[PDB]
Amino acid sequence: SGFRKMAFPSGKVEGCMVQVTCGTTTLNGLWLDDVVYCPRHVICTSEDMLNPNYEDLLIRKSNHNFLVQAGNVQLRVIGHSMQNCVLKLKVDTANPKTPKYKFVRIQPGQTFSVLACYNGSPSGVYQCAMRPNFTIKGSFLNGSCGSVGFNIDYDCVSFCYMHHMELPTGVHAGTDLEGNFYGPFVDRQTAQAAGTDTTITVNVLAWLYAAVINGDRWFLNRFTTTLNDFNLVAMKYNYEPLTQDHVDILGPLSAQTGIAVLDMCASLKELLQNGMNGRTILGSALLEDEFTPFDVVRQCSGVTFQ
Amino acid sequence: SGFRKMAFPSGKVEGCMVQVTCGTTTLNGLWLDDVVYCPRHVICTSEDMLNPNYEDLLIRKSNHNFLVQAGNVQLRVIGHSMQNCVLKLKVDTANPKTPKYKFVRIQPGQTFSVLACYNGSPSGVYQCAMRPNFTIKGSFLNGSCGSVGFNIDYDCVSFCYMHHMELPTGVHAGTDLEGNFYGPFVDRQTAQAAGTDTTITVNVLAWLYAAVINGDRWFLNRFTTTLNDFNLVAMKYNYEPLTQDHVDILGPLSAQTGIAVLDMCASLKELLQNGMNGRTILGSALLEDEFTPFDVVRQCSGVTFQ
Ligand SMILES: *[C@H](O)[C@H](C[C@@H]1CCNC1=O)NC(=O)[C@H](CC1CCCCC1)NC(=O)[C@@H](NC(=O)OC(C)C)[C@@H](C)OC(C)(C)C
Ligand SMILES: *[C@H](O)[C@H](C[C@@H]1CCNC1=O)NC(=O)[C@H](CC1CCCCC1)NC(=O)[C@@H](NC(=O)OC(C)C)[C@@H](C)OC(C)(C)C
């Protein structure tokens, strides 16, 4: 038993990370087959950053301007191309450690593991969610650009995130692996702000089920509630609406515990109305929203990868 | 910026995990060079578990009783030997993925990353601490025995923990990689209990410094306190004594923030006396004790491995 913020094992991604250096800028690249993916602002500098124009900037670069290093072995760039906000550097060597992989653009509320990297060397691994405002509450220092977010599904790495920037509020923004930003952010140095965030209600519900699977029952009640009446209370506390699709997704968790989803909603309602009154749930004194229903099933039941 | 429970990248350990099967029992082994390490109760069964006697049990086994599988390639056991509570199975093949490594027995309060495994396949990675009562608050299901805990120091994997058992309270107990249990636990099925736990005070202090490094300052005060007077308040709230050695270890964190350690102690004192009053620190509504002073420096400054 027990419940932990669990990231996926990171070995299949460690084997893909490289350092990319152009001009005065060093960041992280993702080496898959014979292509290295990285954020396109690597072709910027300190005065290119104001209001860039990357097409003009990229036509001025030669292949030998990109220094790409995999270990103490640095690769030869034989071509480049821009796709939205990512560079794709063609190198003369295929990565022999290329896992089976996909590129996926995830929905808000979905979770993924982040392998934080500096100078092409992995630093640490942790679990994050795409917030409803399309930021992520990461842990990123200078030079972490190019670190990726990913899920693992049997032996396939689904890459879902590349890191670009930190916002004044301390949260983080980036792109899918095809260069499209999550959210309304753009890769300029102009005032941008996150936009109001909300709590991922389906995830809270999923974590209460995790609590019940692990032996916490103190917050349950006899009451129930309708979906409209739950949503009327969730709105007041800045929670997202729960859709019938969310209810369905929470089916297995309901069926395994014997607590109807609408009954767990009545529990959350009273939890939001009265606070936790100095108790904890799964070691937390706040209602936790960065576990998906899939996360709970995986950890409380024990799915692996090979 | 930002602050996260960060585990070490797990690739160098994923490459060592194997499945070990003997009789009706399947658990996880650690393959380093030509030896596979695993918990010795793999030679038990459902009636061997009552009050075992592993010397007698082990002299009755032949090498071909141990089925050891690394991928869809299973190894040949050519010898075995017991060392405290771990089996060391000699195999005819050296693991080509053996990292540079050490075996270290850690102190309470120290943290490490756990690679949870089933049937030799890594499942997920997370960060834990050795509690003052020598248990760990892990996340472990049946078949997770043999999963290891580790730190990484440049390119050297310091293995510090092998998983053996869960206790009635839901916490977890195991050994160092030489088979010595942490704590007073033994590998029998007899009533054992954890013993009262305490909060790791130096770690709390270290995490408040993490908070200040990241922009939280609301909990600081002008007051200060002596070490005796801090320890008199910590005792009342079930915190461990803070030694001068702890103060020294918190030197760099003090020097980087301009907050004397004894001043941060006065902050914690008021935090313990008045609660947090509905505020959070680094996203937590409880004082967090599973970050060491080294953990904070690593994450807030950005040390890697290669
Ligand atoms: C790349 O490694 C780096 C990662 C950040 C540094 C600190 N934490 C990070 O996550 N990204 C940047 O430094 C980035 C540079 C590019 C320049 C051209 C395209 C935009 C990003 N700059 C930032 O993240 C800055 N944020 C920013 O300008 O956001 C505006 C307001 C929308 C950071 C470094 O500045 C602070 C002051 C921290 C907000
Ligand atoms: C090995 O994979 C497994 C891991 C635990 C199963 C569930 N969670 C775990 O971490 N370890 C065991 O199942 C272990 C078997 C051996 C048998 C001989 C030596 C002792 C351990 N048994 C337990 O962990 C049980 N705990 C236990 O007997 O502790 C006593 C009270 C000291 C667990 C499975 O039983 C419960 C009811 C969960 C406490």
PDB file of C-alpha atoms in Angstrom, chain A residues 9-192:
ATOM      1  CA  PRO A   9      11.255   5.336 -15.054  1.00  0.00           C
ATOM      2  CA  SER A  10      13.364   7.737 -17.107  1.00  0.00           C
ATOM      3  CA  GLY A  11      15.992   5.515 -18.688  1.00  0.00           C
ATOM      4  CA  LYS A  12      14.491   5.454 -22.171  1.00  0.00           C
ATOM      5  CA  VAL A  13      14.624   9.322 -22.214  1.00  0.00           C
ATOM      6  CA  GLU A  14      18.012   9.788 -20.555  1.00  0.00           C
ATOM      7  CA  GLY A  15      19.378   7.943 -23.600  1.00  0.00           C
ATOM      8  CA  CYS A  16      18.006  10.671 -25.906  1.00  0.00           C
ATOM      9  CA  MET A  17      19.184  13.874 -24.235  1.00  0.00           C
ATOM     10  CA  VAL A  18      21.924  15.983 -25.826  1.00  0.00           C
ATOM     11  CA  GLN A  19      23.398  19.450 -25.398  1.00  0.00           C
ATOM     12  CA  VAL A  20      22.836  21.975 -28.204  1.00  0.00           C
ATOM     13  CA  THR A  21      25.016  25.081 -28.400  1.00  0.00           C
ATOM     14  CA  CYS A  22      24.690  27.928 -30.891  1.00  0.00           C
ATOM     15  CA  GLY A  23      26.360  31.278 -30.374  1.00  0.00           C
ATOM     16  CA  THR A  24      26.212  32.153 -26.685  1.00  0.00           C
ATOM     17  CA  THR A  25      23.202  29.899 -25.975  1.00  0.00           C
ATOM     18  CA  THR A  26      23.393  26.340 -24.602  1.00  0.00           C
ATOM     19  CA  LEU A  27      20.239  24.280 -24.003  1.00  0.00           C
ATOM     20  CA  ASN A  28      18.996  20.692 -24.237  1.00  0.00           C
ATOM     21  CA  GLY A  29      18.072  18.704 -27.328  1.00  0.00           C
ATOM     22  CA  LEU A  30      16.093  15.494 -27.892  1.00  0.00           C
ATOM     23  CA  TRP A  31      17.928  13.039 -30.161  1.00  0.00           C
ATOM     24  CA  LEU A  32      15.576  10.537 -31.843  1.00  0.00           C
ATOM     25  CA  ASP A  33      16.813   8.586 -34.877  1.00  0.00           C
ATOM     26  CA  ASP A  34      18.899  11.148 -36.825  1.00  0.00           C
ATOM     27  CA  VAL A  35      17.066  14.321 -35.695  1.00  0.00           C
ATOM     28  CA  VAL A  36      17.711  16.557 -32.677  1.00  0.00           C
ATOM     29  CA  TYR A  37      14.671  18.544 -31.472  1.00  0.00           C
ATOM     30  CA  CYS A  38      15.152  21.701 -29.402  1.00  0.00           C
ATOM     31  CA  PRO A  39      13.478  25.088 -28.769  1.00  0.00           C
ATOM     32  CA  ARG A  40      13.977  27.484 -31.670  1.00  0.00           C
ATOM     33  CA  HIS A  41      14.995  30.409 -29.438  1.00  0.00           C
ATOM     34  CA  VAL A  42      18.453  28.746 -29.334  1.00  0.00           C
ATOM     35  CA  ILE A  43      19.126  30.842 -32.444  1.00  0.00           C
ATOM     36  CA  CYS A  44      18.339  34.024 -30.446  1.00  0.00           C
ATOM     37  CA  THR A  45      20.792  35.939 -28.258  1.00  0.00           C
ATOM     38  CA  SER A  46      20.386  38.716 -25.669  1.00  0.00           C
ATOM     39  CA  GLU A  47      19.277  41.293 -28.275  1.00  0.00           C
ATOM     40  CA  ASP A  48      17.500  38.800 -30.561  1.00  0.00           C
ATOM     41  CA  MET A  49      15.162  38.072 -27.627  1.00  0.00           C
ATOM     42  CA  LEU A  50      13.241  41.408 -27.613  1.00  0.00           C
ATOM     43  CA  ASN A  51      10.903  40.839 -30.593  1.00  0.00           C
ATOM     44  CA  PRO A  52      12.393  38.066 -32.760  1.00  0.00           C
ATOM     45  CA  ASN A  53      11.552  36.876 -36.271  1.00  0.00           C
ATOM     46  CA  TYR A  54      12.878  33.383 -36.515  1.00  0.00           C
ATOM     47  CA  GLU A  55      12.598  32.801 -40.272  1.00  0.00           C
ATOM     48  CA  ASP A  56      14.984  35.733 -40.878  1.00  0.00           C
ATOM     49  CA  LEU A  57      17.189  34.528 -38.038  1.00  0.00           C
ATOM     50  CA  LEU A  58      17.315  30.953 -39.320  1.00  0.00           C
ATOM     51  CA  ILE A  59      18.178  31.710 -42.964  1.00  0.00           C
ATOM     52  CA  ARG A  60      21.324  33.458 -41.646  1.00  0.00           C
ATOM     53  CA  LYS A  61      22.663  30.334 -39.865  1.00  0.00           C
ATOM     54  CA  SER A  62      24.973  27.642 -41.279  1.00  0.00           C
ATOM     55  CA  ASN A  63      24.857  23.995 -40.158  1.00  0.00           C
ATOM     56  CA  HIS A  64      28.260  24.326 -38.478  1.00  0.00           C
ATOM     57  CA  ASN A  65      26.832  27.018 -36.177  1.00  0.00           C
ATOM     58  CA  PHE A  66      24.956  24.313 -34.215  1.00  0.00           C
ATOM     59  CA  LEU A  67      27.257  22.437 -31.823  1.00  0.00           C
ATOM     60  CA  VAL A  68      25.507  19.204 -30.774  1.00  0.00           C
ATOM     61  CA  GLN A  69      27.107  17.016 -28.130  1.00  0.00           C
ATOM     62  CA  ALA A  70      26.029  13.514 -27.067  1.00  0.00           C
ATOM     63  CA  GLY A  71      28.430  12.609 -24.250  1.00  0.00           C
ATOM     64  CA  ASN A  72      32.074  13.293 -25.042  1.00  0.00           C
ATOM     65  CA  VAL A  73      31.040  12.624 -28.663  1.00  0.00           C
ATOM     66  CA  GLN A  74      29.635  15.552 -30.589  1.00  0.00           C
ATOM     67  CA  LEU A  75      27.450  15.090 -33.663  1.00  0.00           C
ATOM     68  CA  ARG A  76      27.613  16.733 -37.089  1.00  0.00           C
ATOM     69  CA  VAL A  77      24.591  18.819 -38.101  1.00  0.00           C
ATOM     70  CA  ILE A  78      23.840  18.140 -41.773  1.00  0.00           C
ATOM     71  CA  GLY A  79      20.564  20.066 -41.993  1.00  0.00           C
ATOM     72  CA  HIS A  80      17.991  22.065 -40.046  1.00  0.00           C
ATOM     73  CA  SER A  81      14.343  23.012 -40.335  1.00  0.00           C
ATOM     74  CA  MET A  82      11.894  24.956 -38.202  1.00  0.00           C
ATOM     75  CA  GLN A  83       8.474  23.571 -37.249  1.00  0.00           C
ATOM     76  CA  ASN A  84       6.362  26.007 -35.238  1.00  0.00           C
ATOM     77  CA  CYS A  85       8.493  26.821 -32.173  1.00  0.00           C
ATOM     78  CA  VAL A  86      11.001  23.904 -32.347  1.00  0.00           C
ATOM     79  CA  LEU A  87      14.181  23.378 -34.348  1.00  0.00           C
ATOM     80  CA  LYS A  88      14.821  20.017 -35.988  1.00  0.00           C
ATOM     81  CA  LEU A  89      18.558  19.568 -36.520  1.00  0.00           C
ATOM     82  CA  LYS A  90      19.434  16.749 -38.910  1.00  0.00           C
ATOM     83  CA  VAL A  91      22.555  14.918 -37.719  1.00  0.00           C
ATOM     84  CA  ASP A  92      24.695  12.374 -39.534  1.00  0.00           C
ATOM     85  CA  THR A  93      24.294   9.711 -36.819  1.00  0.00           C
ATOM     86  CA  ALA A  94      21.159   7.904 -35.712  1.00  0.00           C
ATOM     87  CA  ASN A  95      20.791   7.542 -31.962  1.00  0.00           C
ATOM     88  CA  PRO A  96      21.165   3.794 -31.298  1.00  0.00           C
ATOM     89  CA  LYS A  97      19.226   4.296 -28.032  1.00  0.00           C
ATOM     90  CA  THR A  98      16.110   5.629 -29.782  1.00  0.00           C
ATOM     91  CA  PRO A  99      13.142   4.012 -27.995  1.00  0.00           C
ATOM     92  CA  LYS A 100       9.802   3.259 -29.534  1.00  0.00           C
ATOM     93  CA  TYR A 101       8.078   6.599 -29.241  1.00  0.00           C
ATOM     94  CA  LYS A 102       5.186   8.843 -30.208  1.00  0.00           C
ATOM     95  CA  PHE A 103       4.591  12.597 -30.089  1.00  0.00           C
ATOM     96  CA  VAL A 104       1.262  13.432 -28.430  1.00  0.00           C
ATOM     97  CA  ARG A 105      -0.407  16.743 -27.624  1.00  0.00           C
ATOM     98  CA  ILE A 106      -2.070  16.283 -24.206  1.00  0.00           C
ATOM     99  CA  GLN A 107      -5.218  17.787 -22.737  1.00  0.00           C
ATOM    100  CA  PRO A 108      -5.301  19.965 -19.612  1.00  0.00           C
ATOM    101  CA  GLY A 109      -5.634  17.823 -16.521  1.00  0.00           C
ATOM    102  CA  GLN A 110      -3.348  15.142 -17.923  1.00  0.00           C
ATOM    103  CA  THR A 111      -0.143  14.290 -16.062  1.00  0.00           C
ATOM    104  CA  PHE A 112       3.370  13.462 -17.278  1.00  0.00           C
ATOM    105  CA  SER A 113       6.910  13.008 -15.985  1.00  0.00           C
ATOM    106  CA  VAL A 114       9.595  15.651 -16.587  1.00  0.00           C
ATOM    107  CA  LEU A 115      13.276  14.753 -16.941  1.00  0.00           C
ATOM    108  CA  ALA A 116      15.090  17.966 -15.962  1.00  0.00           C
ATOM    109  CA  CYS A 117      18.371  18.429 -17.840  1.00  0.00           C
ATOM    110  CA  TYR A 118      21.304  20.823 -18.007  1.00  0.00           C
ATOM    111  CA  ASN A 119      24.074  20.678 -20.650  1.00  0.00           C
ATOM    112  CA  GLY A 120      22.513  17.460 -21.975  1.00  0.00           C
ATOM    113  CA  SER A 121      22.834  15.646 -18.652  1.00  0.00           C
ATOM    114  CA  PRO A 122      19.674  14.558 -16.813  1.00  0.00           C
ATOM    115  CA  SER A 123      19.389  16.105 -13.340  1.00  0.00           C
ATOM    116  CA  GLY A 124      16.240  14.640 -11.787  1.00  0.00           C
ATOM    117  CA  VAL A 125      12.782  13.354 -12.574  1.00  0.00           C
ATOM    118  CA  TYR A 126       9.368  14.408 -11.264  1.00  0.00           C
ATOM    119  CA  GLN A 127       5.645  14.295 -12.027  1.00  0.00           C
ATOM    120  CA  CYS A 128       3.610  17.321 -13.251  1.00  0.00           C
ATOM    121  CA  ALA A 129       0.172  18.094 -14.679  1.00  0.00           C
ATOM    122  CA  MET A 130      -0.902  20.408 -17.476  1.00  0.00           C
ATOM    123  CA  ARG A 131      -2.867  22.975 -15.476  1.00  0.00           C
ATOM    124  CA  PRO A 132      -6.232  24.192 -16.805  1.00  0.00           C
ATOM    125  CA  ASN A 133      -4.415  27.439 -17.697  1.00  0.00           C
ATOM    126  CA  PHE A 134      -1.911  25.414 -19.778  1.00  0.00           C
ATOM    127  CA  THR A 135       1.036  26.179 -17.511  1.00  0.00           C
ATOM    128  CA  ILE A 136       2.947  23.555 -15.534  1.00  0.00           C
ATOM    129  CA  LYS A 137       4.249  23.993 -11.972  1.00  0.00           C
ATOM    130  CA  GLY A 138       7.712  22.680 -12.727  1.00  0.00           C
ATOM    131  CA  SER A 139      11.172  23.031 -11.227  1.00  0.00           C
ATOM    132  CA  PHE A 140      13.434  24.602 -13.825  1.00  0.00           C
ATOM    133  CA  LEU A 141      16.624  26.664 -13.721  1.00  0.00           C
ATOM    134  CA  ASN A 142      18.511  28.444 -16.480  1.00  0.00           C
ATOM    135  CA  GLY A 143      19.656  26.012 -19.141  1.00  0.00           C
ATOM    136  CA  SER A 144      16.792  23.606 -18.555  1.00  0.00           C
ATOM    137  CA  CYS A 145      15.238  24.563 -21.901  1.00  0.00           C
ATOM    138  CA  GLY A 146      14.867  21.466 -24.042  1.00  0.00           C
ATOM    139  CA  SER A 147      13.985  19.139 -21.126  1.00  0.00           C
ATOM    140  CA  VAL A 148      10.973  17.042 -22.073  1.00  0.00           C
ATOM    141  CA  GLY A 149       7.817  15.718 -20.485  1.00  0.00           C
ATOM    142  CA  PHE A 150       6.625  12.241 -21.238  1.00  0.00           C
ATOM    143  CA  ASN A 151       4.422   9.292 -20.439  1.00  0.00           C
ATOM    144  CA  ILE A 152       5.304   5.625 -20.978  1.00  0.00           C
ATOM    145  CA  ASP A 153       2.901   3.034 -22.328  1.00  0.00           C
ATOM    146  CA  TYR A 154       4.376  -0.440 -22.256  1.00  0.00           C
ATOM    147  CA  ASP A 155       7.612   0.172 -24.177  1.00  0.00           C
ATOM    148  CA  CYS A 156       6.532   3.330 -26.054  1.00  0.00           C
ATOM    149  CA  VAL A 157       7.611   6.780 -24.859  1.00  0.00           C
ATOM    150  CA  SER A 158       4.835   9.286 -25.580  1.00  0.00           C
ATOM    151  CA  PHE A 159       6.634  12.618 -25.575  1.00  0.00           C
ATOM    152  CA  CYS A 160       4.258  15.422 -24.696  1.00  0.00           C
ATOM    153  CA  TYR A 161       6.238  18.487 -23.563  1.00  0.00           C
ATOM    154  CA  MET A 162       9.352  20.510 -24.257  1.00  0.00           C
ATOM    155  CA  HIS A 163      10.380  23.284 -21.863  1.00  0.00           C
ATOM    156  CA  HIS A 164      10.795  26.885 -23.144  1.00  0.00           C
ATOM    157  CA  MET A 165      10.230  29.510 -20.484  1.00  0.00           C
ATOM    158  CA  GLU A 166       9.310  30.577 -16.977  1.00  0.00           C
ATOM    159  CA  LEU A 167       6.602  33.208 -16.344  1.00  0.00           C
ATOM    160  CA  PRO A 168       6.780  36.005 -13.724  1.00  0.00           C
ATOM    161  CA  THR A 169       4.558  33.947 -11.412  1.00  0.00           C
ATOM    162  CA  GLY A 170       7.107  31.110 -11.198  1.00  0.00           C
ATOM    163  CA  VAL A 171       5.158  28.641 -13.348  1.00  0.00           C
ATOM    164  CA  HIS A 172       6.324  27.266 -16.655  1.00  0.00           C
ATOM    165  CA  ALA A 173       5.327  27.167 -20.299  1.00  0.00           C
ATOM    166  CA  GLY A 174       6.412  25.189 -23.311  1.00  0.00           C
ATOM    167  CA  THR A 175       5.368  23.250 -26.367  1.00  0.00           C
ATOM    168  CA  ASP A 176       4.435  19.827 -27.567  1.00  0.00           C
ATOM    169  CA  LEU A 177       7.208  18.104 -29.485  1.00  0.00           C
ATOM    170  CA  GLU A 178       5.901  19.630 -32.750  1.00  0.00           C
ATOM    171  CA  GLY A 179       6.576  23.139 -31.475  1.00  0.00           C
ATOM    172  CA  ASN A 180       3.031  24.305 -30.671  1.00  0.00           C
ATOM    173  CA  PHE A 181       2.876  26.070 -27.310  1.00  0.00           C
ATOM    174  CA  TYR A 182       0.443  24.908 -24.731  1.00  0.00           C
ATOM    175  CA  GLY A 183      -1.728  27.922 -24.000  1.00  0.00           C
ATOM    176  CA  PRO A 184      -1.587  31.437 -25.358  1.00  0.00           C
ATOM    177  CA  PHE A 185       2.113  31.880 -24.826  1.00  0.00           C
ATOM    178  CA  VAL A 186       4.564  32.841 -27.550  1.00  0.00           C
ATOM    179  CA  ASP A 187       8.362  32.682 -27.569  1.00  0.00           C
ATOM    180  CA  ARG A 188       9.113  36.419 -27.257  1.00  0.00           C
ATOM    181  CA  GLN A 189      10.247  38.497 -24.284  1.00  0.00           C
ATOM    182  CA  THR A 190       6.998  40.411 -23.982  1.00  0.00           C
ATOM    183  CA  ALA A 191       4.689  40.667 -20.982  1.00  0.00           C
ATOM    184  CA  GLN A 192       2.639  37.478 -20.786  1.00  0.00           C
TER     185      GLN A 192
END
